[PDB]
Write an enzyme that holds these catalytic residues in place. Structure first.
Site, PDB file in Angstrom:
ATOM      1  N   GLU A 763       0.812  -1.209   0.000  1.00 12.62           N
ATOM      2  CA  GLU A 763       0.000   0.000   0.000  1.00 12.62           C
ATOM      3  C   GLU A 763       0.851   1.266   0.000  1.00 12.62           C
ATOM      4  O   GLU A 763       0.422   2.303  -0.500  1.00 12.62           O
ATOM      5  CB  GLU A 763      -0.939   0.001   1.199  1.00 12.62           C
ATOM      6  N   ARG A 841      -7.682   3.019  13.977  1.00 13.10           N
ATOM      7  CA  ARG A 841      -8.571   1.879  13.747  1.00 13.10           C
ATOM      8  C   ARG A 841      -8.479   0.954  14.967  1.00 13.10           C
ATOM      9  O   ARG A 841      -9.445   0.280  15.326  1.00 13.10           O
ATOM     10  CB  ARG A 841      -8.178   1.114  12.472  1.00 13.10           C
ATOM     11  N   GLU A1222     -10.777  -7.777   5.078  1.00 12.84           N
ATOM     12  CA  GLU A1222     -10.112  -7.811   6.376  1.00 12.84           C
ATOM     13  C   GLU A1222     -10.925  -8.321   7.573  1.00 12.84           C
ATOM     14  O   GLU A1222     -10.381  -8.986   8.446  1.00 12.84           O
ATOM     15  CB  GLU A1222      -9.595  -6.416   6.726  1.00 12.84           C
TER      16      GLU A1222
HETATM   17  N1  MTE Z   1      -5.567 -13.081  -2.321  1.00 16.78           N
HETATM   18  C1  MTE Z   1      -5.431 -11.922  -1.690  1.00 16.78           C
HETATM   19  N2  MTE Z   1      -6.479 -11.480  -0.913  1.00 16.78           N
HETATM   20  C2  MTE Z   1      -6.502 -10.321  -0.199  1.00 16.78           C
HETATM   21  C3  MTE Z   1      -5.310  -9.469  -0.273  1.00 16.78           C
HETATM   22  C4  MTE Z   1      -4.254  -9.941  -1.070  1.00 16.78           C
HETATM   23  O1  MTE Z   1      -3.172  -9.143  -1.122  1.00 16.78           O
HETATM   24  N3  MTE Z   1      -4.344 -11.138  -1.743  1.00 16.78           N
HETATM   25  N4  MTE Z   1      -5.367  -8.190   0.488  1.00 16.78           N
HETATM   26  C5  MTE Z   1      -6.284  -8.102   1.636  1.00 16.78           C
HETATM   27  C6  MTE Z   1      -6.386  -6.710   2.167  1.00 16.78           C
HETATM   28  S1  MTE Z   1      -5.112  -6.142   3.337  1.00 16.78           S
HETATM   29  C7  MTE Z   1      -7.390  -5.867   1.807  1.00 16.78           C
HETATM   30  S2  MTE Z   1      -7.499  -4.165   2.500  1.00 16.78           S
HETATM   31  C8  MTE Z   1      -8.464  -6.198   0.846  1.00 16.78           C
HETATM   32  C9  MTE Z   1      -8.353  -5.228  -0.305  1.00 16.78           C
HETATM   33  O2  MTE Z   1      -9.191  -5.475  -1.402  1.00 16.78           O
HETATM   34  P1  MTE Z   1     -10.755  -5.119  -1.427  1.00 16.78           P
HETATM   35  O3  MTE Z   1     -10.942  -3.707  -0.944  1.00 16.78           O
HETATM   36  O4  MTE Z   1     -11.286  -5.258  -2.834  1.00 16.78           O
HETATM   37  O5  MTE Z   1     -11.511  -6.123  -0.576  1.00 16.78           O
HETATM   38  O6  MTE Z   1      -8.279  -7.612   0.328  1.00 16.78           O
HETATM   39  C10 MTE Z   1      -7.710  -8.597   1.295  1.00 16.78           C
HETATM   40  N5  MTE Z   1      -7.632  -9.897   0.626  1.00 16.78           N
HETATM   41  O1  SAL Z   2      -8.597   1.530   7.350  1.00 11.88           O
HETATM   42  C1  SAL Z   2      -8.390   2.741   7.341  1.00 11.88           C
HETATM   43  O2  SAL Z   2      -9.108   3.391   8.093  1.00 11.88           O
HETATM   44  C2  SAL Z   2      -7.390   3.348   6.525  1.00 11.88           C
HETATM   45  C3  SAL Z   2      -7.178   4.763   6.556  1.00 11.88           C
HETATM   46  C4  SAL Z   2      -6.172   5.407   5.749  1.00 11.88           C
HETATM   47  C5  SAL Z   2      -5.374   4.607   4.900  1.00 11.88           C
HETATM   48  C6  SAL Z   2      -5.543   3.215   4.833  1.00 11.88           C
HETATM   49  C7  SAL Z   2      -6.551   2.613   5.649  1.00 11.88           C
HETATM   50  O3  SAL Z   2      -6.656   1.265   5.535  1.00 11.88           O
HETATM   51  O1  MOS Z   3      -6.551  -2.021   4.187  1.00 13.44           O
HETATM   52 MO1  MOS Z   3      -5.413  -3.751   3.396  1.00 13.44          MO
HETATM   53  O2  MOS Z   3      -4.115  -3.226   2.496  1.00 13.44           O
HETATM   54  S1  MOS Z   3      -4.223  -3.879   5.466  1.00 13.44           S
END
Ligand code: MTE
Ligand code: SAL
Ligand code: MOS
Ligand code: FAD
Ligand code: NAI
Ligand code: MOS
Ligand code: FES
Ligand code: FES
Ligand code: CA
Lengths: 1289, 99, 50
Positions: A763, A841, A1222
């Protein structure tokens, strides 16, 4: 030099300039253009580089197939071998092999980076056994890792080889007759007499000896020559230990080093025999020979069960493990205790001597002479009155380094219980394999009884001492294992000589139980169109290509003829002044191009989310891993070597490593964060009980199978640059690259196809590599790339934030909470990054699902000399939720009430406000709670757990059910925005583009599902190619689990715009097709391109006034897990897990269940297996899968059930769905508290009688913490048996 | 662009329409994934028709930035852009023309 | 266009055109072409997938 001739997927390869240092992986990827095989760790642990090798075995006169790690296989060992990669068994361009088809249709692939390797392990099994049993299938993956799936889908789909998410009935049957034939040319080359070959490389000469005579001559002629067979040890030495062996001799071909002779004293194996052969031969001997003659054999086999995976065991030689003589070798203790005979030869000389304590004089050394070589090893048959045991305990059962491992043999006088011989040999207790001679010597002539037991333990406790600074640490745990192991041995021999029923299980060897998997979800409305896939289990759109190895990841992108490679140069000090840099020796490495530092930056060296970081270290380093500069060279190896010889002179400075050092030195980022509601004073005053304590939860390495990677293409015009990056934040990558170069943002283009995993680790921290590669591109004018090795990634990129909490909770005898106080401290690292929002958070979740009338939570970011920590699935939520469930658990114990009862009565109810004053609408935890209780049969199992604990003294079972709620939305309001761009081409095909990126979560799949439903056309007519800054600008990072929510809306609106434009033509030609309406629109000059945008409404929380909505809604769920711990080793089984998740009306139940399982497993790893160890000086020890243990195939709950809550539409998101990324991760904590439940049963067994005792258990609950917490006569003895002249009365 | 200076003219047009220096505007290339179903660059009408498309797109941008321009009359183009972004107002749009 | 760097594995194509204004193609023999160093393949109407 001779020509190296082998085959790859049927095609003959003739390498005339083979370099001994070249690995198959490098060859396949950089020379043959076969990029399906991936680099995941380079140390034999992930299995992502798995391929199949075939060859005609001269001694067996048959063709044999076996897996192997391309990353460790020197091509020079492959002369006349046939390699088979994932591209050689099938593809989407031709036809998918059944293996590829099933893993894809079964949803066994998410990010897909591990799919090829896993496909090849399965394939290799099938090529050996067309109809394998469930057990064989499960064991095929001892050496393959996956971070996304939770493994369940992969195993369930593959077991077929032995509403619903998939239908095995559609699966194409396996047909061996249709498999590729063994290269006809090779079969002819078998009649040809083997000949000594010689290969010459840049720094290494390799000699493939064809006969024993040749080998001995070579050894005599070149004593310094290094032997190599499987290279699973040497590759690590050269790759990671900075070793260089000018000359290498591979004796792998020699008949004598491969012969297997069944003699009267035992079975003899040539030193080159692969462990898989030893394992197969021994399994056979055990099945045919009397049990009394195979005691040692079974010892060897027990160690081999948990010895690496199939890939390594298939190439790892028996002699290789023996001679490497590592202190933690699992075989040497067994060979020593048994007196296994070693035949050592040299030109002329020869001898066969039993292995004893003297065979290992010092660290990694043996009694062998420089000219001598281990010819063969004869493992002895066990005699009458002779019993044997072999044990091993690590952090994880599968493929792991032993903390303590051993071999134990006892020989009694004929038909007696009187010891004639006793040998207790251990690994992991010294800088070599040692025998407790002093202890066992005292027991000769003694009898096998309680006194001998107490004596031996006391003896071991004193003879096997460990200084507090012993390598590997875990002093207490280790010593405890040495005694626990003997105890297990003591009891087993008693049993064998023939025992309390409650002691029996302590003698049982690990037995895997039969798996059970059930998923439950809701079917879509009966009248829903077959083309409307919203709500259906549509497989991930790239799964088939991921399974075939056609899916392109950043480094798979071919290199330009003039593309250079970058290797970062990092600090080896946690805090010090950079006195100078000397690149004189680097400039000497062939292919050296240049060394880049801060002074080369044209724009700004100030980077980071809060501009508190350097792109390149300037005058001072603030953490081990701090990027100082970078070397650019013509190849990866050359850049690596040059970088390694760059000399940096430092002057140390006071360092602050731990959270403790931070608090005492007042080293924080910003001021304290806090949320306070109610009246604490009045709260605690009304409380009947009050519990205070401290809790710690360790960090976490994302371990995405694909490490950080960036390719930067400098155009040479107006500062323009195009970058291909593995990142979740194309926007920041773009702005940071531009800021560093000092050019407008409109000059930089960042493109993201897919990521082999992100999990938050990509990120922001992806820019550390991107900006550096960009600088190299700018300076050289050449395209440049860099993919991080796992050790670099783990050391530099940061991970989850370790948390320390100090809490105080007040409650009534009823268990009702009336007051809570918690001070959170996170170890942020050497920069702010996302630490502040993470703490926020954290505070937003310190309540989990319970209403606490008087509450106060605070948080502080600790400024330390450690790589900056960042976002990680959960983003601070898991830590805060874990802390909450910890005190909740202590409240239950203190009140002497059933935990489920205490949790339920404290639970929020519809309409309640949280501590941050947000109303809980559509609060479904009660529903998930009740269904999980029922479907999991919690109460019934509750009584069965107690029973088990009453019938077992050294094994206990625990059971726990916990809830969770997760606020959905970036807590930074302006990040809750999303854009989309849609083009309808004249052939009617649609190209959708949006701000989100694909990392395995199936964001694109869902966006196509949405577009298809919105436009009312089949998904076949829609496509999403990539994410780029020139199609959708100013995008938020793909995170906070809201991507589907927000991009879904952006895509939806763009589609609505399309439909409005096509409406007139739809009315003019009602019976026309979509293609007709599109073409007519084009002809009429109506734009068929439009943007879409969404802005999450009513968001804006203030920590100052404790008001305003912080989230759009919450995603809920409940998980019930049961475990069984081994009170004597720390090991445990995840028997069963039941999960009920509320994701509203799932857009795709297959992907949503995949996310639940994947997150659950990642939480499981966080709370029970994953642990990073740092030296006191702040230097990370754990830099690879070998030392860092994430969940393995065998780590998942044996019985794994997942249900998506029915009839719970969420009017707050696209098509009534809910974020799922998450939210489920914390549910993995259910396993943690089940374990603590089991530990309390153990303590009430051997510790004390205080039913309300509150012992501290920090996360992760690894074997070490589990065992140490199971206080008994052995743990105690390890302290007292390690006093003062006087003692106050 | 084939040498007739179409991009130069388009930048000149964007600059005048948005009322900002040409130095703050850039045109990198022409690609089918940014603007689909384009007519070939011919008939001497490119400046005419793309000039209008670019102009219209610029108009949309000005209307989105208007509110922030009013709240901060003496601010800079950068100030209005950042404020619009933080207020979650899209800074991307299409422009289209039909003779 | 041609100033764009070539990928390390990038190949080169050379058109094969008619030396007649109007005629039937009786046959095509690439036997000699196949002998040229670096030759990869000869593409014709039969290789088109669409
Ligand atoms: N296979 C896979 N799933 C995953 C991830 C990933 O890197 N690989 N990232 C996770 C995280 S930290 C997040 S914030 C969300 C992000 O994608 P979304 O907003 O579309 O759910 O997917 C989750 N599931
Ligand atoms: O989960 C959040 O609240 C958040 C806020 C700022 C940047 C990334 C983040 O996941
Ligand atoms: O909000 Mo997911 O990249 S820890
Ligand atoms: C992922 C992974 C997991 C592993 N798991 C385990 C485990 O659980 N337990 C454990 O104990 N080990 C483990 N190992 C260690 C390793 O696989 C063994 O030590 C292996 O058996 C060495 O065999 P090799 O043929 O690959 O050795 P090489 O790397 O080829 O050689 C190893 C050393 O042995 C010497 N040597 C080899 N053959 C002879 C001979 N005939 N005569 C004289 N010297 C010789 C070489 O010169 C060199 O010093 C693991 C390794 C990896 C990469
Ligand atoms: N890569 C993998 O997944 C696995 C590798 N292995 C084996 O593990 C080996 C590890 O090698 P290294 O990283 O160099 O570590 P190592 O070979 O130096 O072994 C370290 C261990 O030896 C013991 N030890 C060493 N010195 C000691 C001392 N002075 N006092 C007390 N105890 C001491 C400790 O238990 C310590 O954890 C590999 O070479 C391989 O053979 C084993 C299992 C899994
Ligand atoms: O209309 Mo110009 O390309 S002949
Ligand atoms: S790259 Fe080969 S095991 Fe991980
Ligand atoms: S699907 Fe296995 S690591 Fe991503
Ligand atoms: Ca940080």
């Amino acid at each position: 030099a001779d020509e190296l001739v082998f085959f790859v997927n049927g095609k003959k390869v003739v390498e005339k300039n083979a370099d001994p240092e070249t690995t198959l992986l490098a060859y396949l990827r950089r020379k043959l253009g076969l990029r399906g095989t991936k680099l995941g760790c380079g140390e034999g642990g992930c299995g992502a580089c798995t391929v199949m090798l075939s060859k005609y075995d001269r001694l067996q006169d048959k063709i044999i197939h076996f897996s192997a790690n391309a990353c460790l296989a020197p091509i020079c060992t492959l002369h006349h071998v046939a390699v088979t990669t994932v591209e050689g068994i099938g593809s989407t361009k031709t036809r998918l092999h059944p293996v590829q088809e099933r893993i894809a249709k079964s949803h066994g692939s998410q990010c897909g980076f591990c799919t090829p390797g896993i496909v090849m392990s399965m394939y290799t099994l099938l090529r050996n056994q067309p109809e394998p049993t469930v057990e064989e299938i499960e064991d095929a993956f001892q050496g393959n890792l996956c971070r996304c799936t939770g493994y369940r889908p992969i195993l369930q789909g593959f077991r077929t080889f032995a509403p619903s998410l998939f239908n095995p009935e559609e699966f194409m049957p396996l047909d061996p007759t249709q498999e590729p034939i063994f290269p006809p040319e090779l079969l002819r080359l078998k009649d040809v007499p083997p000949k000594q070959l010689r290969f010459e490389g840049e720094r290494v000469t390799w000699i493939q000896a064809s006969t024993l005579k040749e080998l001995l001559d070579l050894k005599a002629q070149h004593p310094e020559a290094k032997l190599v067979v499987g290279n699973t040890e040497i590759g690590i030495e050269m790759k990671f230990k900075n070793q260089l062996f000018p000359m290498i001799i591979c004796p792998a071909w020699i008949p004598e080093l491969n012969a297997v002779e069944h003699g009267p004293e035992g079975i003899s194996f040539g030193a080159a025999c692969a462990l898989s052969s030893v394992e197969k031969t021994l399994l056979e001997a055990v099945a045919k020979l009397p049990t009394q003659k195979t005691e040692v054999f079974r010892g060897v086999l027990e160690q081999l069960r948990w010895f690496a995976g199939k890939q390594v065991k298939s190439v790892a030689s028996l002699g290789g493990n023996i001679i490497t003589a590592s202190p933690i070798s699992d075989l040497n203790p067994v060979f020593m205790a048994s007196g296994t005979k070693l035949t050592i030869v040299s030109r002329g000389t020869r001898r066969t001597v039993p292995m004893d304590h003297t065979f290992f004089p010092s660290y990694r050394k043996t009694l062998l002479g420089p000219e001598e070589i281990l010819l063969s090893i004869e493992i002895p048959y066990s005699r009458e009155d002779e019993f044997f045991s072999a044990f091993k305990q690590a952090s994880r059962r599968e493929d792991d380094i032993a903390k303590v491992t051993c071999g134990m043999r006892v020989l009694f006088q004929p038909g007696s219980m009187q010891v004639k011989e006793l040998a207790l040999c251990y690994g992991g207790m010294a800088d070599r394999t040692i025998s407790a001679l002093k202890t066992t010597q005292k027991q000769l002539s003694k009898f096998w009884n309680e006194k001998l037991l107490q004596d031996v333990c006391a003896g071991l406790a004193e003879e096997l001492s460990l200084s507090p600074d012993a390598p590997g640490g875990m002093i207490e745990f280790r010593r405890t294992l040495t005694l626990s192991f003997f105890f297990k041995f003591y009891l087993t021999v008693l049993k064998k000589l023939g025992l309390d029923p409650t002691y029996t299980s302590a003698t049982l060897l690990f037995q895997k139980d039969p798996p059970a998997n059930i998923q439950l979800f809701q079917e879509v409305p009966n009248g829903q169109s077959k083309e409307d896939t919203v709500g259906r289990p549509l497989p991930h759109l790239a799964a088939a290509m991921q399974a075939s190895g056609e899916a392109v990841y950043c480094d798979d992108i071919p290199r330009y003829e003039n593309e250079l490679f970058l290797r970062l140069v990092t600090s080896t000090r946690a805090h010090a002044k950079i006195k100078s840099i000397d690149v004189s020796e680097a400039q000497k490495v062939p292919g050296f191009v240049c060394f880049l530092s801060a002074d080369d930056i044209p724009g700004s060296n100030e980077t980071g989310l809060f501009n508190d970081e350097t792109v390149f270290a300037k005058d001072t380093v603030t953490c081990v891993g701090h990027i100082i500069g970078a070397v650019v060279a013509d190849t990866p190896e050359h850049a690596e070597r040059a970088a390694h010889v760059v000399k940096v002179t430092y002057e140390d400075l006071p360092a602050i490593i731990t959270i403790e050092d931070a608090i005492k030195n007042n080293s924080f980022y910003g001021s304290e964060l806090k949320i306070e509601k109610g009246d604490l004073k009045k709260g605690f005053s009304e409380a009947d009980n009050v519990v205070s304590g401290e809790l710690y939860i360790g960090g976490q390495d994302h371990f995405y199978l694909e490490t950080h990677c960036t390719i930067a293409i400098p155009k040479g015009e107006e500062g323009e640059m195009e970058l291909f990056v593995s990142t979740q934040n194309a926007m920041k990558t773009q702005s940071f690259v531009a800021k560093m170069l000092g050019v407008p943002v409109n000059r930089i283009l960042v493109r993201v196809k897919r990521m082999g995993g992100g999990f938050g680790g990509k990120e922001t921290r992806s820019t550390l590599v991107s900006v550096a590669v960009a600088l190299a591109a700018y300076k050289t004018g050449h395209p440049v790339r860099c993919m991080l090795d796992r050790n670099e990634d783990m050391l530099i990129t940061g991970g989850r934030h370790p948390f320390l909490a100090r809490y105080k909770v007040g409650f009534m005898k009823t268990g009702t909470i009336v007051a809570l106080e918690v001070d959170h401290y996170s170890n942020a690292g050497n920069s702010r990054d996302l630490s502040h929002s993470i703490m926020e958070r954290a505070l937003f979740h310190m309540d989990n699902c319970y209403k606490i009338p008087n509450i106060r939570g605070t948080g502080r970011l600790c400024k330390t000399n450690l790589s900056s920590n960042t976002a990680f699935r959960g983003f601070g939520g898991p830590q805060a939720l874990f802390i909450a469930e910890n005190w909740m658990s202590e409240v239950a114990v203190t009140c002497g009430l059933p935990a489920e009862e205490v949790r339920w009565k404290n639970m929020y109810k519809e309409g309640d406000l949280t501590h941050f004053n947000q109303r809980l609408e559509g609060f479904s935890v009660p529903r998930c709670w009740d269904e999980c209780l029922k479907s999991s049969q919690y109460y019934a199992r509750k009584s069965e757990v107690d029973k088990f604990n009453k019938e077992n003294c050294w094994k206990k079972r625990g059971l726990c059910i916990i809830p969770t709620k997760f606020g959905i939305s970036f807590t930074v309001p302006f990040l809750n925005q999303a854009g989309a761009l849609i083009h309808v081409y004249t052939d009617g095909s649609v190209l959708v583009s949006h701000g989100g990126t694909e990392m395995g979560q199936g964001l694109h799949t869902k966006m196509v599902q949405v577009a298809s439903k919105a436009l009312k056309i089949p998904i076949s007519k829609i496509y999403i190619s990539e994410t780029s800054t020139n199609t959708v600008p100013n995008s938020s990072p793909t995170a906070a689990s809201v991507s589907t929510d927000i991009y879904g809306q952006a895509v939806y609106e763009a589609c609505q715009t399309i439909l409005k434009r096509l409406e007139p033509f739809k009315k003019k030609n009602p019976d026309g097709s979509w293609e007709d309406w599109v073409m007519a629109a084009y002809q009429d000059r109506v734009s068929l391109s439009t943007t879409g945008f969404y802005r999450t409404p009513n968001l804006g929380y203030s920590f100052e006034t404790n008001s305003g909505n912080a989230f759009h809604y919450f995603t809920y769920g409940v998980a019930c897990s049961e475990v069984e711990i081994d009170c004597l080793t720390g090991d445990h089984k995840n028997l069963r897990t039941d999960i009920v998740m509320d994701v509203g009306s799932s857009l795709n139940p297959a992907i949503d269940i995949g996310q639940v399982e994947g997150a659950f497993v990642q939480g499981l790893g966080l709370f029970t297996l994953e642990e990073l160890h740092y030296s006191p000086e702040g230097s990370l020890h754990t830099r690879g899968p070998s030392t860092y243990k994430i969940p393995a195939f065998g780590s998942i709950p044996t019985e794994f059930r997942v249900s998506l809550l029915r009839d719970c539409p969420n009017k707050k998101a696209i098509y009534a769905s809910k974020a799922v990324g998450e939210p489920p991760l914390f549910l993995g904590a259910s396993v943690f508290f089940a374990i603590k439940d089991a530990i309390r049963a153990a303590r009430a067994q051997h510790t004390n009688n205080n039913t309300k005792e509150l012992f501290r258990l920090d996360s992760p609950a690894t074997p070490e913490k589990i065992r140490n917490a199971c206080v008994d006569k052995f743990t105690t003895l390890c302290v007292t048996g390690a006093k003062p002249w006087s003692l106050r009365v």
